Every structure is written in C-alpha cells, then in structure tokens.
Symmetry: C5
Subunit: 205 residues, 5 copies
C-alpha cells in the first residue's frame, strides 16, 4: 500500500484518461467466453438465457510502468470504473444484461488489462428441437457497438468455448460451443464491424 497508492495516483489522477482508440491508434481486444449454464428456454417467445463469464483483454501504453520504480509491483486490481473499457455488446439481446460479478480489472505493468465480468443474458433463439437427440443450435454476436474494424479489432485465443465450469446438473448438455471472429460489412455503413460469434448447439437432459 506504500508505492501502490503512489502508482495509482500517477496513472489516474495526474494523467488524463484514454478517450478510446482511433483509426490512427487502433486497439485489439481479445475475447473469450466461459459458458456456465443454460438457465431458461422460452419457446413461446424465442428467448434463451445464458450465464457466462466474458474474458476481455487489451493493452494501452498509458497504463504501462516500470516495476523498479514502484516497489517491484508487477500488477494490481482496481475498479473497472477507474479505467477505460471497450463497448463490447451482444447484437441480439432481448433484455438488459445483468452483472453477477464484481467489476474489477487487473492491470499489468505492460499496460495489459484483464477484465472478466460474469453475466446473465437473454437473447434471440428459436429453441425448437432442444428435446431431440439432434438438439438445437443458437448463436449470438459480440462486438463493439460504435467502433469500426479500423478502430477496434477483435481476436480470440481459441475457437473453443471454455466448458470446464459448465454446471453439472444443468437442464441441458452442451453439444458444441464455438467462438469465431467475423468481419461484418453492413449495408448501412462504409466501415466494417468485427464480432466474435458465440455458437452453441445443445439439448435437454
């Protein structure tokens, strides 16, 4: 708490805050999902609720420091409201996402930030076939809402969704879960937008 108080002051109070990436200084955000449980399936309205962890990672020069000047501190924890965060969001949610975890990020001396919110999400899915052997497939896109591919690019560290914390006695079993970076060119806008596509095939019991 000696040099850690002095470090956080030198980063947040003295210096201004990141106003977000630009075309001249773009940013790459790494995205990884941890599927925990499929909680609800509404066939009357086509809604499916997921509980998942959202791994987000990015790096800013204006967060870097030299450990030898701050008690050999390599990393720290702080409120996610102390730093800038990307506007990563689902394209087809039907309700406001609810947050299940503390909003705290980890900041490392290279300027890399690690932020992993646990969330609950209702989204659009016709769940017809979930009670069959073949199951049913759903998909929901995640990406920046207002920044283009020239300002925020996405990447994944793997095409496989982490299922190592999927709830055992879940009403549903996961057949396949894949997260896949796409580059989307919409008819509305001259700039492309980049998303990671969370695709899940699943079935009952």
């Amino acid at each position: 708490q000696a040099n850690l108080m002095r470090l956080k002051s030198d980063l947040f109070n003295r210096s201004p805050m990141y106003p977000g990436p630009t075309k001249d200084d773009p940013l790459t955000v790494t995205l990884g999902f941890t599927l925990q449980d499929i909680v609800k399936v509404d066939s009357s309205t086509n809604e499916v609720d997921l509980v998942y962890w959202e791994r987000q990672r990015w790096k800013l020069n204006s967060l870097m420091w030299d450990p030898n000047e701050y008690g050999n501190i390599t990393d720290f924890r702080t409120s996610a409201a102390d730093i800038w965060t990307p506007d990563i969001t689902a394209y087809s949610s039907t309700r406001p996402v609810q947050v299940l975890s503390p909003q705290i990020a980890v900041v490392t001396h290279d300027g890399s930030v690690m932020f992993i919110p646990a969330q609950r999400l209702s989204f659009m899915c016709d769940p017809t076939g979930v009670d069959s052997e073949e199951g049913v497939t759903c998909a929901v896109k995640f990406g920046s809402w207002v920044y283009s591919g020239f300002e925020i690019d996405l990447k994944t560290d793997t095409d496989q969704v982490d299922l190592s914390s999927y709830y055992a006695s879940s009403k549903y079993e996961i057949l396949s879960a894949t997260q896949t970076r796409q580059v989307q060119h919409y008819s509305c806008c001259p700039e492309p937008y980049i998303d990671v596509n969370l695709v899940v095939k699943f079935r009952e019991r």
Copy 2:
C-alpha cells in the same frame, strides 16, 4: 489519443452544454427504425413488445471543428452523457423502455451526431387476428415530448423500416413496416407538433 483529448476538452470543457433548440434556432432530428424482432404478444392486456434500433441524427454548429487543427481527426466516439440529446419518446408505451446497447454517440467535424440505441419497448396494441392469414397491424408514434415543431422538426431518410437485421427464425413474419412523418397543427395545444408513425403489419408463422 493526443489530439483527441485536446479536441474533446475544447468542445466540452470550454463551453457550457448546448441548451437545446429554440424558436429562433430550430433543429432537425432525423429518425430511422431497425426492427430486430417482435418479442412478446399479449392479447390479455393488449401489449406487444419490440426490439429495435432507433437511429437519431442531428447537427450542431457548436460541435464543429477543423480536422487540420486536430491531427486530421474527422470524427470521434463519446458518451451520450457528454452531449445534448433529443427527447424522442414513444407516445404509447406501457413500460419504461429498456436500453440494450451502450450509450455512445458518433460526433463528426461537420458537427453531426449519430446515435443508435438498441431498445426493448412495450406499447399498446390489440394483437387479435395475429394467428390469421391477414395478420394484425400495430402502430406507435415517436416524437419529442416537450418540443413543438417550431423547435424540433422530424424527418426520415426513407419510409421503409429497416428489416435487414430481422430475426431469421422469428415467431412472426413482417408483412409491411413503414415509418411516416406526421404533423399535427393541433394536439390539444395551439402549436404544431410532429411525430414519426411506426406502422407494423405481422402474423404468426
């Protein structure tokens, strides 16, 4: 990050916020709807729920700059709470509108602002006949709540609601989707009032 900080502070920290339009200095807000899905139909209460993107566009002289002065930044993204926004509301909602996307807008050097919140709206519609071949038509009007057409004029770039992102496997099919500007030279108050009427015709299957 260097020129953008200076730009954001010159625009926001060096002038009081735009107090809004007046009779002498009216404003034109362009409006457009993207129907993503019809999410709920209640024939017992006559409530229908929509998920849509509401595109709002306007231009302010006080938000103009010369890029040459700012490292040739032509546009930037900022929190919607940094800038003035129009009081566009649905005239027949039954529940508070729920925001599904980040509250971020796009400001351009010409002074223009693009703001597209994704939203869930519950409004008044008798869905009787939805299970017929002919379907049922709902309608909901959007406009400024407190500004007359003398301060805020409305406008659409097209009469057709954007259906390019409509849920491929939706519970309902859209038969027609129109967005129409309407002007009341009388609405219980001696003053011209303007709305954009959203008319949606749809049926089950």
Copy 3:
C-alpha cells in the same frame, strides 16, 4: 443558444434553489389527468394498472425573467432536476410508480412551470363486477406527501378527466372519469392536506 445559456445560468447557477413553499409563502399546484389506458386488472390481488399523463402547473417568482434582457426568449425547456418540483404522489399505490416520458419541464417568463410526466401506476382496486354491464368503480387520490394545505394547495382546470387520448382498442371502455379537489384531515395532525381524487368507472369490452 448564447442567450438561453445565459438565462439558464442566471436562473440555476447564480441563486440557491427554491427551498419549497412555506406557510408564509404558499403555492398552488394545478393538476390534471389524461387517461391513456387501463392496462392490467388483477382480481386475485385487487390491483389495477393505469397509464396516464399527469399534468402539473405552478408559478415561482424566482423563475421570472424579462424577455428583453434575454433575446426575447419567452420560455424554454430544461431538465426537471434543474428546478424544484412538488411531492405529489398517489395515496394508494402498491408498486413504485414508473415514468414513461422524459423528465423535462417547460418554464415561462412569468415564472410558470408546466410538467407532464407520463406514468404507469399500480393501485388498490377490487375490480369485481368489471365483466358486468354496470362495471366497476375504482378510485385513487393524489396529493403532496408532506406539505399541508397551508403550504401547497391544489386545484383543477376541469373536473373531467381527459379521455381524448384513450386507447381506441383498449380492453376496457370508460364509463366515467372525474378528478375532484378534496380536503383531507388526519387524526395525527391538525393541519388539513389537499388532494385530488381520481374516480374511474369502467367495464370490459
């Protein structure tokens, strides 16, 4: 915009906020209701849901200005948070009232304020007989919570509830809707309180 910025700064940033009325300087608030729809009837809990606009009007000398001193501005819109508002509330709600419109008010140069929040309200009503030819009668009264008649008085411009914007395809037809000034005395307190009684008789179909 230059003059309006100045008027608002002069009103809101150079004088302490109005501390509300007192016995020595009372206030009269005008109240009117516009019934848009009866959205829910629950005979198992005796709750009825209304959607209405509540019109509130009052005058403060501390909001007066001479137009000549400010570009001939005669009136402007501002956030309701910028001004004092009366604590008018429904007496028999069963759930927190929900606001459906922007919290913005019109201020006029003579010091008059017009504030019209659209709302959804759940209140105590036994709807027994609503499917009868005669119908059922519900009532909810609205008043200040902590200001007596010596500090806040209420009046109405008409005794008839505005039904000109009632949903044409509502589940319920309105047989009569009145709004009446009433003096209430409580056992706890000597001072009388003033409210406005909203009486609505309606039926199905």
Copy 4:
C-alpha cells in the same frame, strides 16, 4: 424564502453531517406503523407482501434553531438525503423494500425529525389457515441493523397499528395488529438489543 434558504444553509452547510449516535450520546427512535393493505399471500413460498408506512421520529440538538432568528420559521420540509436517518430495517424480509412515497422529512425547530416512507415489504410468513375463520398470525421485527441498544433505543407511542387507512375493499380482514417494543439481553454482551415486533392476525374476506 430568504430565511428558509439561510436556515437550511446554516444547518446543512455550515456544519458536518451527524455521524450517528454513540454510547456517550445515544438516540431514541420512535417507531409507528400504518397498515394500508395486504397485497400478496404466497402459500408455496411462505412469503407475504405488505403495503404500509413506517413512521420514524428522532431529535437532534444539531438540528435545533430559534424561530426568532429566522423570521418565525418553526419547521420545514427537506429531502431525506440531506439529513442522517436511522438504519431501521426489517429482520425477516425476503426481497428489497420498494419505496412508494417521496423521501422527504419534516424538521421542527426543536430538532425533532419526522420521516414517513410508504413501502411494499415482502417477508417470511406461512399463511396456512388464512382462509379459515381463525385466520393466521404473521410477525416481522424492525430495528437498527448495526446499532445496539447502547446507541439506538426504540420506542412506540402506541401498541395499536394504524388501521385508519386500511384498504376498504381488501381481499383480507384484519383481526388484530400490534406493534410491540421488545428487548433481548445476552450473556456474552452488556449491550441490549431492541426491536419493534409487528404482529398481524388476519383472514380472507
């Protein structure tokens, strides 16, 4: 209004907020309840919902003033957020309480404060026998959450619950309703613990 603003400035700005009661300077909170309706009874979850008013009264020397020094002002109204309030909490709630009235308090020149929030409360109650003629009895205790009897004392003005505003067409019929101060000493601690027990016997029709 000049004297009021001056008085408010003197109480809330020329001084720090009351840090709360201590063992050297204890405080007595008078508690009284007003039952308005019993709105929900869930026999499967053992939850009952009340709509009631919680009357709290205490007196601070720091809130005293001589009316002669302030143009004869003997009392005023002000947002509950401007002053300290006791942590009177229900001990067996199942859900967060929902506020139904404005949060304004009345402050009298003797330093006394009167604060009466209207609330919807969900609490633990096996309602078995509510349809019988003997009905059912439910109870919920109210007191400080973190202050012992050494810091906050509780007191009632009467043992009868105010039924003068009980909903006339309520689904239920109140057989008895009492509010009783209770003290429980413990062998580990010299500090007593104080609560007011709200006991309601009721039945259908």
Copy 5:
C-alpha cells in the same frame, strides 16, 4: 459526536484510500453464514433462492487508532462506501444478489472491520429429490473474484452454518449446513484461489 467527526475525518479525508492487499501486504478475510430461509426452489430451471446474512471480518492497520486521543472511542459505525471492502462473491449465481440490509459497517480501534449484509441469492441447483425423505443437496462457492490466495486468504470461525435464525414455519427443514474452506487450482492460472463452500442438505415439511 465532536470527537467522532474528527476521528472519521482523520481516517477517511486526511488519508489516501486503501488500495487493497498485495502479495507483499496480504489480507485475511474471515467468513461466516447465517441461513434464514430457503425461499424458492425451481425444478424446471434448476434454481434455488436463499436468504442469509454473510458475516465478513478483516483488519487493516490503516484503520487503527488510539482511543485515548479521540475520547475513548473504541468503535464506530460508518457507511460501507467510506471504506474498502473485499469482493467476496458467489461463483454460481444466476441473478444479481439482492441486498436486504443497510450497507453499514463497524470499525474497531484495533483496525478490524465487521460487515454483515443480509442478502437474497439465486444459484444453480438441481432440486431433484427435495420432496423425498433423503432430501436433496445444494452447494455454492463464495470467494474473491480478482484476488488470489497470495493477496487474499479466507478463514471460518466454525464449520457449521448458523441455523439459529432459520425460519421455523419454513417450507423446508435443514438436514445439514456446512461452511468449509477449500483451496483450488484452476487451469487458467498458476496461482491458487481460496473459497468457502456452503453445502446444504434439506427437504420439504
């Protein structure tokens, strides 16, 4: 109350905010659960709702003080927002935890802090067999969300969950309730994490 104001001002305002523990200056959080009721069991979504109090205890050296310098004050109550708090969270919640008690803590002159918030938690649990004589078992982990064992270790003053406040007329009786410290090693990280595993076996009637 004069001494208390000066104490709180010396500890909070004339001192930098505690930045949380590190590898160098780690922290031990003592954890305890008082179970009040099992309020909901959903067998179609595998969700169980608990209401409980969560006793948190820890000690900062930065919150120590000499009572002799501040009028023999041994402890005081203050908002949980005035001080740093551990990010203890449930690992398998399905909805945001709902706080039922005031967010106030107690700080002792030795620097120790006791924080006991009442809560409603929804978590993943297959309730299959609850209506049987053997009953059913649920488990939920609680621990820091961003800190490892190096920064935060957990402790329990006992291994039995307090059932002395369990609702007597509950829909369910408890068969066993344990709170047991566990040390994990998730594959993502080379550092260990501490958690306390609340395990509850129970049944109807």
